[PDB]
Design a protein around this ligand. Structure first.
Ligand SMILES: Nc1ncnc2c1ncn2[C@@H]1O[C@H](COP(=O)(O)OP(=O)(O)OP(O)(O)=S)[C@@H](O)[C@H]1O
Ligand SMILES: Nc1ncnc2c1ncn2[C@@H]1O[C@H](COP(=O)(O)OP(=O)(O)OP(O)(O)=S)[C@@H](O)[C@H]1O
Ligand SMILES: [Mg+2]
Ligand SMILES: [Mg+2]
Lengths: 452, 106, 493
């Protein structure tokens, strides 16, 4: 061949095994080629570096993540093949066919055949490389769509001058282990190394940190004249190594989860150099130890902007959907008897399985209303009857909690609320219920004290 | 070496197109005739390629796991091994990560 | 102008009229005589099918070469008979007593595929057309409705009204037109029509309205149609039609039973009467046989070969098409032997015998799954062996995949003595090389899942977890047992 292998820094097998499968002669070229990798593993970068190193052969860049189901995929293929040929061989009479006419795979075959048989006026047979970058990143994807793209060169004509050669790009490896007997040339992309991530980030990012003016205004805000370009790039690479050895156990081997951490923690690191932190590597790290212990990636006082009865309804629904229904007359029953009766004894042995790790239980609405007026604070001289009854506002706030997806139920499609067969459950976790019970000052830690 | 690779192809996937996809980047990456001759003498590419074909299935990408991710995976497999039908969640997994790491610091 | 929510750029509509036959004149008393109308009943422009005839004829060139067995392979194609007489006579009488009496009967024939029912019905219609040409009866327009030759099961109305009337409407206008034409138009202005309902059990769709209408237009006094509907099971209106439509179809229900070995021998005798034991003038140079260098050759399609081909196919399903397929495969085997032995190539006597037709009788009694699982790979046979010996432990037929994996690992680790398995257990897990860690799955695991999934040996349920995905043997367990006993290594491993 006459292809030029690119100098990709850490994919040395893959560019050699990629120049052994992409050529300008359609006979020494496979009709399908998979490039299976994972997120960040360098597929698109080495593909674009290869196709830019070889300007003579023709690419069609198509990304089936912004084309959700299969019909915009066929329409986009039939659109952009024709648009690529219009700007490749301009002096051929090109009768524009509508890509929206493609509605089925057969009509893609017929449309592409009618597009290709009008370019017979060339001299020699060429291949056109249609790249489906992210074929497993299709959103409404099925297991039998890929069989419709393998067996497409079986339908395009054999003695034609433009031959379609596909280059897929997969991401999942349980997708690809279905199309294994088809024996397509697979070029796998293994996950990057920490020693390779730590310098991929340096060669990618230390250009746009010295050219990031938050540091180039800090060098003149601090009156710094003991600097050169090495004195900027060494603290840039040292910061990148600091984010790597600090946060690699957090992210993993993903360039994307490191790029944004470097983007976040950079100006709060430039704001710690004063006059001589640019010369040393250790007291600058001891001047900014606060941004290398915790990650600080969340979007950050109070907990929830709800009412009082809705907060107590959330607490009571949290109680009754984790407590067994038999043991509540030992925890809430408090009033003096007049008639001979016995209360609930309670559980003998504390079970240490910790029920509030699991999924909740399902209760009737009378148990929520009963536990609601047991845990409610006193309101309101003998005609008050201060034990609050469930008025309109309690039911309205309960329906508001069901609307806000905080209490929830067995979602049958368009369920009736007023049935004695629809039971309710909470779907908020413990970590917000503790903040809520802290807000209304409700002792809930001693409600699950008899489990752990 | 070539007959040995054909012999292990005969017991694995018994197919000529897998051999074709093995042989094609051997012939195409070579640059001189002596290089092609020693490359098919030694078969220096049918173990580079054949290593790369298994480079991420369940072993070549578990090899690239980090340390916290490995402790989380080990704890989750412990929790699923302890259960009846093999199910768990993030709370039952983190209640084994901190227990294991507290026994590490013990 | 407008922005549309979706597009239908590839739409093709026919040119078919919407107003039915009821609104041509809107005068029942002034309907013209429909029989001798120019357009009705195929009296005008009946070249409407023979437009595409001079497309599949090219060059009349290059001197095609027949052989001594090309004649029998031509006479064994689709084409009195001593096969169907008590059915032909009853059907022709039951359809003649309505042609002569201007009646509205319905005949019901049925049989397993191959028993000659459509052949006898089409010959009944040919004989009644001969009787119409002899003019002992009135004439009719013949309509064949094939149940499977149409893309929509309601297009029966369209093709029937088109054949009757020369105009094509939509299917709703055609069913209203046929309803009016079969209810109200008097029996002086309509000549009768006979309708063959070929393969009736493919128009039972979603309402049973087509099956209603074609058997409820024949209960009318003013409709001269005869429905000679064929079927594929005798008790069809007791299974998939209503009891009222069972009462419409009635009580005739003439079954076409299966053939016998004597009847089938007579059939092949009549098919080869013009060729058996005759003489041909072949040439040594090519082989071009010509019936009455040059060699006079006999042709003994032997009666013992005919009857041993006929007894088996008379037992299994009794089909006068499968008998022709057997006796054509025998002639094909003979022609292949002849051409390979003489070097003739396309541009003593010849025989067809018992140990020559037994290959044509054995070509369809071979399960090529045992000779497939023997030539399968070692890892695929090991997969099948792990699945087979998990079954005696479990008793479910539906083992998981994580169990098959650990059973394969168990067999490989527990056989550490055999020289074959210690040679193969290195490559089975590491592809015979270092710089490759010991894989969890064996090499070629997804390959030998898929190579049995596509072949239908294996049967896996869909799920995302390839440890708990269940897997079933779709073929059998007994034939897998009889296919795993010829390996010389899996017989002990
Ligand atoms: N070997 C490398 N040399 C230089 N930069 C690299 C290298 N590998 C990755 N990068 C950088 O990291 C980015 C990784 O993105 P991609 O190469 O597109 O990976 P990816 O697999 O395509 O991600 P997906 O599959 O689209 S989620 C590239 O855009 C480069 O900026
Ligand atoms: N007695 C016979 N004489 C000659 N040919 C026959 C005879 N019986 C059946 N056949 C063959 O069968 C064909 C006629 O089709 P039939 O078998 O009558 O239709 P059928 O029985 O309805 O089969 P299906 O199920 O509708 S495809 C002819 O081409 C003949 O070759
Ligand atoms: Mg990409
Ligand atoms: Mg038929």
């Amino acid at each position: 061949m006459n292809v030029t292998t690119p100098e990709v820094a850490f994919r040395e097998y893959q560019t050699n095994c990629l120049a052994s499968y992409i050529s300008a002669d359609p006979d020494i070229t496979p009709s399908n080629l998979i490039l299976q990798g994972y997120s960040g593993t360098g597929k698109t970068y080495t593909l674009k570096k290869y196709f830019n190193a070889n300007p003579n052969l023709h690419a069609v860049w198509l990304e089936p993540v912004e084309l959700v189901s299969w019909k915009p995929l066929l329409q986009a293929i039939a659109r952009t093949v024709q648009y690529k040929l219009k700007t490749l061989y301009p002096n051929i009479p090109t009768t524009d066919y509508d890509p929206l006419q493609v509605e089925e795979p057969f009509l893609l075959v017929k449309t592409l055949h009618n597009i290709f048989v009008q370019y017979e006026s060339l001299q020699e047979k060429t291949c056109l490389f249609l790249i489906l970058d992210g074929f497993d990143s299709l959103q409404d994807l099925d297991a039998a769509l890929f069989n419709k793209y393998i067996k497409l060169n079986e339908l395009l004509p054999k003695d034609s001058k433009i031959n379609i050669k596909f280059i897929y790009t997969m991401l999942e490896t349980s997708f690809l282990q279905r199309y294994s007997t088809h024996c397509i040339p697979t070029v796998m992309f293994p996950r990057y190394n920490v020693d390779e991530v730590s310098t991929i980030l340096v060669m990618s990012r230390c250009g746009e940190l010295m050219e990031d003016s938050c540091l180039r205004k800090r060098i003149i805000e601090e009156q710094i004249t003991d600097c050169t370009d090495d004195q900027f790039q060494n603290v840039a690479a040292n910061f990148i190594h600091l984010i790597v050895q600090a946060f690699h156990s957090y992210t993993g081997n993903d360039i994307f989860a490191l790029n944004d951490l470097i983007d976040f923690k950079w100006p709060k690191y430039v704001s710690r150099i004063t006059k001589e932190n640019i010369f040393e590597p250790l007291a600058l790290y001891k001047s900014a130890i606060k941004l290398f212990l915790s990650t600080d990636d969340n979007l950050s006082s109070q907990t929830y902007d709800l009412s009082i009865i809705s907060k107590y309804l959330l607490i009571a629904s949290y109680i009754c959907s984790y407590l067994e229904p038999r043991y509540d007359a030992s925890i809430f029953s408090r009033k003096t008897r007049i008639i001979q009766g016995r209360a609930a004894y309670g559980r003998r042995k504390k079970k240490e399985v910790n029920p509030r790790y699991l999924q909740p239980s399902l209760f009737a609405i009378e148990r929520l209303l009963a536990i609601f007026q047991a845990i409610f604070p006193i309101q309101g001289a003998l005609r008050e009857e201060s034990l609050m009854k469930a008025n309109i506002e309690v039911f309205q706030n309960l329906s508001e909690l069901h609307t806000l997806k905080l209490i929830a139920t067995t979602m049958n499609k368009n369920i009736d609320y007023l049935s004695p067969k629809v039971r309710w459950k909470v779907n908020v976790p413990w970590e917000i219920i503790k903040e809520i019970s802290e807000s209304v000052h409700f002792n809930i830690s001693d409600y699950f004290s008899d489990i752990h | 070496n070539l007959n040995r690779h054909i012999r292990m192809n005969f017991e694995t996937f018994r197919s000529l197109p897998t051999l074709k996809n093995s042989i094609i980047p051997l012939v195409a990456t070579s640059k001189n005739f002596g290089s092609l001759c020693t490359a098919i003498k030694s078969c220096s590419f049918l173990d580079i390629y054949n290593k790369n074909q298994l480079s991420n299935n369940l072993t070549g990408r578990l090899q690239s796991l980090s340390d916290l991710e490995l402790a989380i995976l080990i704890s989750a497999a412990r929790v699923a091994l302890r259960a009846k039908d093999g199910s768990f969640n993030f709370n039952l997994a983190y209640a084994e990560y901190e227990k294991m790491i507290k026994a590490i610091n013990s | 102008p407008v922005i549309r929510k979706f597009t239908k750029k590839n739409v093709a509509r026919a040119k078919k009229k919407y107003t039915p036959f009821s609104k041509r004149f809107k005068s029942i008393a002034a309907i013209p005589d429909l029989t001798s109308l120019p357009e009705f009943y195929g009296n005008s422009s009946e070249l409407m099918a023979s437009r595409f005839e001079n497309k599949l004829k090219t060059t009349q060139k290059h001197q095609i070469v027949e052989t001594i067995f090309s004649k029998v392979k031509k006479q064994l194609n689709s084409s009195y008979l001593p096969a169907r007489e008590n059915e032909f006579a009853s059907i022709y009488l039951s359809a003649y007593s309505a042609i002569e009496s201007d009646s509205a009967t319905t005949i019901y024939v049925a049989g397993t595929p191959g028993v000659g029912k459509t052949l006898t019905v089409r010959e009944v219609v040919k004989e009644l057309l001969s009787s119409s040409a002899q003019r002992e009866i009135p004439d009719f327009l013949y309509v064949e409705i094939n149940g499977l030759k149409m893309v929509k099961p309601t297009d029966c109305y369209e093709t029937l009204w088109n054949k009757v009337s020369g105009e094509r409407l939509t299917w709703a206008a055609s069913m209203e037109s046929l309803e009016f034409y079969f209810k109200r138009v008097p029996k002086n202005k309509k000549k009768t029509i006979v309708v063959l309902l070929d393969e009736l059990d493919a128009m039972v769709t979603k309402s049973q309205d087509i099956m209603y209408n074609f058997f409820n237009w024949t209960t009318y006094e003013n409709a001269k149609l005869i429905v000679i509907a064929v079927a594929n099971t005798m008790d069809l209106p007791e299974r998939q039609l209503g009891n009222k439509i069972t009462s419409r179809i009635g009580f005739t229900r003439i079954m076409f039973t299966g053939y016998t070995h004597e009847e089938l021998k007579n059939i092949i005798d009549l098919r080869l009467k013009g060729l058996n034991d005759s003489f041909f003038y072949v040439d040594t140079k090519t082989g071009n046989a010509i019936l009455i260098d040059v060699r006079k050759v006999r042709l003994r399609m032997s009666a013992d070969a005919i009857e041993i081909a006929s007894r088996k196919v008379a037992s299994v399903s009794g089909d006068a098409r499968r008998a022709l397929k057997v006796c054509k495969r025998a002639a094909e085997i003979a022609e292949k032997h002849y051409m390979a032995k003489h070097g003739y190539g396309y541009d003593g006597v010849q025989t067809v015998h018992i140990t020559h037709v037994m290959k044509a009788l054995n070509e369809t009694l071979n399960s090529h799954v045992i000779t497939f699982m023997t030539r399968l790979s070692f890892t695929a046979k090991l997969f099948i062996y792990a699945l087979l010996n998990l079954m005696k432990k479990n008793g479910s037929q539906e083992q998981e995949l994580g169990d098959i994996v650990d059973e394969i690992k168990l067999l490989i680790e527990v056989n550490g003595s055999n020289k074959f398995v210690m040679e193969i257990a290195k490559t089975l897990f590491q592809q015979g090389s270092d710089n490759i860690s010991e894989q969890l799955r064996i090499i070629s695991w997804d390959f030998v899942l898929n190579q049995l999934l596509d072949a239908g040996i294996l049967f896996k349920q869909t799920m995302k977890n390839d440890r708990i995905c269940c897997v079933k043997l779709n073929i059998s367990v007994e034939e897998a047992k009889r296919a795993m006993n010829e390996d010389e290594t899996l017989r002990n491993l």
